[PDB]
Point group: D2
Chain length 121, copies 4
């Protein structure tokens, strides 16, 4: 699924996820968020299962973006955990955790959770 | 916090997280899980906020492990999202999402969620 | 939104959520899961914001199902946290946590996370 | 575990959870949050597995609080999903989702996630 995953993906928010899958399981690229006071591209890295089950299962993957680039610093990071589903309409189906740097007093509200679905169009 | 983060961390399960923080926000290293039929070291990559708030806030970070190495393939990936808290007892406080590759029929039960706290001892 | 919420809802899995919203913020009813070896109806209870913002915001709500009825006992419970969005196509948009009773040794894999979207058709 | 669960519990934040477990699986009571601009008691309802496994497993449960009482309205709701662990030091180990009522434009940041551990002291 190296070629399956490599490319440009869009989620339901209009965000842009540009990734290369390495033969070794690497994910590298850039993320551009349509929401959350992000601007321009942010580095992302992650991993995927480079030898997935042959049984019709999705391919497990995740990646991280720290929301610091030359334009802005949100003092936060998102991880997306999900699976690549190949075929007519290839999807990456994810759930994500965004942790903001906080004081101990605000640690309880440090983390947002959501779900993003990525498509090739 | 590059030096703060770089090193060997342990969670409440006896898992071992070995990471280097790059000046550019990179996280690279290896993870060894004490649970979940993992064996030996797995590659991890992630990101951290290399220019955190100066106001006593934690430093946002996350990373990914795909559970494939030369020993095993769980057909899964975990992301940890959290923050590094410096000082006497440095912590990485995380929440995690583990996605298993599944069929569409099992996609609803694809994802586990938990929380790991990492200490330097 | 008492009348808005009261009724029969379906999620993307074909599950059936039958709820009454009380004037006091109560949610009571039954859930029938199309997946996960559930059979027939299970009691649910929850709460909703009976005096929501007037500013176009959704109405916050959640509810719990313990997966025990006269037919089966999964030794588990799901909570759905989300918001009711009124209008042409009323939705309840949720995220959920399913905790299984486990031993301490399996506590780390106790909890599944997902997202369900409920519609009136 | 009806008697096990019934009582007054405290989490790591100094919050107060007062619950009665019904013979029928009901949870009813009040929650007082030490954080998050909550004041005084809020109604909670939930469910627990009234016939748990006999094998040393925890007892699955969850409950909901909508953050409206006579003092305040946060336009939000939290669900706690977890398990009751009996014995010398009885615990309720939970993970929680807090959904705020939002506009569609802010729906992506509607939901906070955390973990609370409740003890009888």
């Amino acid at each position: 699924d190296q070629a399956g995953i490599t490319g440009t993906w869009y989620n339901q928010l209009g965000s842009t996820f540009i990734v290369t899958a390495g033969a070794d399981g690497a994910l590298t690229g850039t993320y551009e968020s349509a929401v959350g006071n992000a601007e321009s591209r942010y580095v992302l890295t992650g991993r995927y299962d480079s030898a997935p089950a042959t049984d019709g299962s999705g391919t497990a993957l995740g990646w991280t973006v720290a929301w610091k680039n030359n334009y802005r610093n949100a003092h936060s990071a998102t991880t997306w955990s999900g699976q690549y589903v190949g075929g007519a309409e290839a999807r990456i189906n994810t759930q994500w955790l965004l942790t903001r740097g906080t004081t101990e007093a605000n640690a309880w509200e440090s983390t947002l959770v959501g779900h993003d679905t990525f498509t090739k169009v």
